[PDB]
Structure 1
């Protein structure tokens, strides 16, 4: 399987910037969502989920084909709760109907990070919608009740090394778990809709208590009212993971740079970009445009 990226006929950067600005204006406006957390977090998660189905072995899955749009994928249990991000994006697509799906889902993730004060994430257009039959089967997304070994193994299928995994994970500073969706309940920290290294700090600074929740699953609870999934916790149990955690706990810039790089890679997995494809775009935030 080869997935060549193909630019939406006749579109340029300015075309993309507009889709970006629309998402952003919308994020700004719909701030009541999930108790005033806003849709940032969920869009970030969505871009990760349409992208995490990839399989470096056979090149199936990944962001390319925008298959989330199909029932099989859309209804994946691991996907519970993502429908709200989709719904957020729907009208945007209606306004900009020539954008491919995979392009839109993934751009929402970039927009979300950047508008939530994260680092700039270069992004590339060119994703093409594929047929319903290219929809990966459910079961490719990772479980949360596991450990570092599982985590390592898992991310390996997506070609991510330890450093990439710890970087990516710091996105857990955003949003929160919801019982009805995954069987976990609680936020990982305090500034849940602003992008910072908070995740590492909490994991290193709080006094976590293992407990079972109402769904009868285990989670690490903190006095401050925070939580950590077993997979989150596993990062301090592993020697290799732990020192990277420490590093991010100490240097938010390092964290941002590594995150940026890992995130793009994650969203660009499985796609082939011809030599004549345009360079990646770096979008301006609203604020940079004075809007």
Structure 2
């Protein structure tokens, strides 16, 4: 259902150059998980009914950075600003989604397709649309399904984004990595979720919700057994998330 806009050759050349610069920067700075979180938090505010929010550059605004679910994302924005300044032709919206795609690639994940053309919008969405880590399956469906318009498959695959990174007690309050290799994009999130709590590792109530739901659980099992299947479904879901409200809602 997507009809992608035309951008100039110069715009396309900037996308390609920025992609390379983002690879080197993100790898050197060890900030792939923070950048994936920035991209997801940016996109996840989309509401299909009103066609408001979504990946349109608003996360750089102090008002959106101040949302409790976005604690620490001011660091991500600050980290990217010098590189963004080398690409004035690119929208912030495109730049942040490109950073998210690169974060997945540089950690060894799938190559998520990227299409340019998002425009920077003036007004941030209201606070409270991002998912609550303390809630369960009904809540996940309210946020990813009723608001964003994504599928149950997308919910499980995207939850696998937690295969990289960690929570911080000073940000959310939760603490620690989901996996033993938090800079490696693999299916270990699902294998750890299945094996139960392990010292040093994290499971949010929202992660655990996937285990007890009749639709989510078979997907968790599938992804734990088959990393290729996880990668395929992940790439599909990340692309959709990154394009919410864009080139047709």
TM-score by length of 1: 0.81
Could you give the per-residue CA deviations for residues 195-247 of structure 1, whole angstroms, max 9, x where no partner exists? 000011011123x2xxxxxxxxxxxxx23x21100000111011211111000
2:39 is aligned to 47
Could you give the per-residue CA deviations for residues 64-83 of structure 1, whole angstroms, max 9, x where no partner exists? x3111222212211110111
Distance 1:7 1:89 in 2: 25
Q: Structure 1: where are the runs of 5+ without partners?
A: 31-37, 209-221, 274-291
Report if aligned partners of 2:14, 2:89 keep a CA contact under 8 Å in 1: no
Alignment of 1:197-212 (within 5 A): 197-206=187-196, 208=197
Residue 70 (structure 2) pairs with residue 71 (structure 1): no
Distance 2:13 2:105 in 1: 17
2:52 is aligned to 60
Alignment of 1:115-194 (within 5 A): 115-131=106-122, 134-156=123-145, 157-194=147-184
Q: Helix, strand or coil: the match of 2:171?
A: helix
1:28 is aligned to 27
1:212 is aligned to none
**Displacement after TM superposition at 1:129 (Å):** 1.3
1:245 is aligned to 220
Larger radius of gyration: 1
Residue 15 (structure 2) pairs with residue 16 (structure 1): yes
Q: Helix, strand or coil: the match of 1:263?
A: helix
Could you give the per-residue CA deviations for residues 33-66 of structure 1, whole angstroms, max 9, x where no partner exists? xxxxx10000000000010010001100111x31
Q: CA RMSD in A?
A: 1.7
Report if aligned partners of 1:118, 1:196 keep a CA contact under 8 Å in 2: yes
1:215 is aligned to none
1:102 is aligned to 93
Distance 2:88 2:34 in 1: 22
Q: Helix, strand or coil: the match of 1:182?
A: coil
Report if aligned partners of 1:235, 1:245 keep a CA contact under 8 Å in 2: yes
Q: Structure 2: where are the runs of 5+ without partners?
A: none
**Displacement after TM superposition at 1:28 (Å):** 2.8
Equivalent residue pairs, number: 246
